[PDB]
Amino acid sequence: DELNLLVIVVDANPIWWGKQALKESQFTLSKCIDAVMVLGNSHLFMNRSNKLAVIASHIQESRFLYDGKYELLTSANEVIVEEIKDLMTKSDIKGQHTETLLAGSLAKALCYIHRMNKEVKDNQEMKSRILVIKAAEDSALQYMNFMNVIFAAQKQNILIDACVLDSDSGLLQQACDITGGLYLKVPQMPSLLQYLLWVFLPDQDQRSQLILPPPVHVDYRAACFCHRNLIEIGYVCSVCLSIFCNFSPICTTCETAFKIS
């Protein structure tokens, strides 16, 4: 009855992969796609009850991606390749939006997980986890919405695993710390698949007996809106929760004067 779902979100920002391609490094987007497909095939291999969900995170939208080889594996790989080529071939940069819709892809993944769980019969319990690979830079404006995702997963007790390739994201670190998922940056991009298999492939119960690298240290500093500097102790607004370094009689954000006689 153990139904393991491993939703994989792929950072499919064309700009970062173009930068990497111009660098002519050993690792490209094709290798990333191949590693993701192999990991998903292995996940489906480990048990019949296991399910695979692959969604590509792109700036324009979040795409639901899904001869001597397994029939279902071959069909799934064909579908994934078809969808990714259809998206990237028609991926026309129209606008200055560079940050990928990371939050939207996570929200769509959570909706898909909820729909699967509703479709899952009471006879079986569907353990769910999400693995996200980070390649491009992190986004700022999504932060709040990103937070809305995190607790939501913690609402349904879903692990969130982060695989940073190039650009670190403290948001991902905090999400992994909160939801209990694993955060780790790949030192050598060509070795990505083994990092996926050795660490992110086993389930948490399997991870329980397994010995794994300790989680990275996570900080929780704050930005003082008037200057957005690091702050240890700050003045918290009781109206709109805006934080200030110095005492103020009127809050800039809530526009409500602090009635301190």
Partner 1 sequence: RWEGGYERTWEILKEEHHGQVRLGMMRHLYVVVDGSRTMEDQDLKPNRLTCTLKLLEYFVEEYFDQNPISQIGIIVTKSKRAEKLTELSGNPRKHITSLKKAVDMTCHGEPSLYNSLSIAMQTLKHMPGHTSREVLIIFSSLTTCDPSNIYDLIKTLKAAKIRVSVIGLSAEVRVCTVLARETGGTYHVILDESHYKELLTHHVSPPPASSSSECSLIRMGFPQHTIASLSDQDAKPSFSMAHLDGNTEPGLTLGGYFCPQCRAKYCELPVECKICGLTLVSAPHLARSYHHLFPLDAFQEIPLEEYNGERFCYGCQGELKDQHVYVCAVCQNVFCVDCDVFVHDSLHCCPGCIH
- Strands 62-64 and 51-57, by their bridges, are antiparallel
Q: Which stretch binds partner 1 (CB under 8 A): 9-17, 71-79, 121-129, 242-250?
A: 242-250
Instruction: Tell me if 117 sits within 8 A of 20, measured CB to CB.
Output: no
Q: Pick one of 81, 88, 152, 216: the residue that binds partner 1 (CB under 8 A).
A: 152
Breaks (C-N over 2.5 A) in the chain follow: 66
The DSSP output letter for 144 is H
Closest by CA to 46, choosing from 207, 202, 200, is 202
Q: Which stretch binds partner 1 (CB under 8 A): 7-15, 121-129, 201-209, 246-254?
A: 246-254
- Looking at the Cβ atoms of 210 and 257, the one nearer to partner 1 is 257
Residue 111 has φ and ψ, to the nearest 5°, of -60, -40
State in angstroms the smallest separation of the CB of 112 from Zn ion.
9
- Please work out, in degrees rounded to the nearest 5, the angle formed at the alpha carbon of residue 150 by the alpha carbons of 95 and 94: 5
Q: Pick one of 62, 142, 169, 242: the residue that binds Zn ion (CB under 5 A).
A: 242
Contacts of residue 197, defined as CB under 8 A and 6 or more positions apart, other chains included, come to 39, 42
Residue 138: CB atoms within 10 Å:
18
What's the one-letter identity of residue 61?
A: E
- Note whether 240 binds Zn ion by CB under 5 A: yes
- Note whether 251 binds Zn ion by CB under 5 A: yes
- Note whether 232 binds partner 1 by CB under 8 A: yes
Question: Sign of the CA dihedral 140, 142, 147, 149?
Answer: negative
- Note whether 23 binds partner 1 by CB under 8 A: no
Per-residue binding letters, 111-150, with partner 1 (x by CB under 8 A): xx-xx--x-----------------------x-xx-xxxx
140 binds, among partner 1, Zn ion, none (CB under 5 to 8 A by kind): none
- Note whether 239 binds Zn ion by CB under 5 A: yes
Q: Which stretch binds partner 1 (CB under 8 A): 35-43, 77-85, 151-159, 185-193?
A: 151-159
- Note whether 227 binds partner 1 by CB under 8 A: no
State in angstroms the smallest separation of the CB of 6 from partner 1.
17
The DSSP output letter for 199 is I
Cα 153 → chain centroid: 12
- Looking at the Cβ atoms of 218 and 243, the one nearer to Zn ion is 243
62 binds, among Zn ion, partner 1, none (CB under 5 to 8 A by kind): partner 1
Instruction: Tell me if 181 sits within 8 A of 161, measured CB to CB.
Output: yes
> What are the residues binding partner 1 (CB under 8 A)?
61-62, 64, 101, 103-104, 107-108, 110-112, 114-115, 118, 142, 144-145, 147-152, 155-156, 174, 178, 217-222, 231-241, 244, 247-248, 251, 256-260
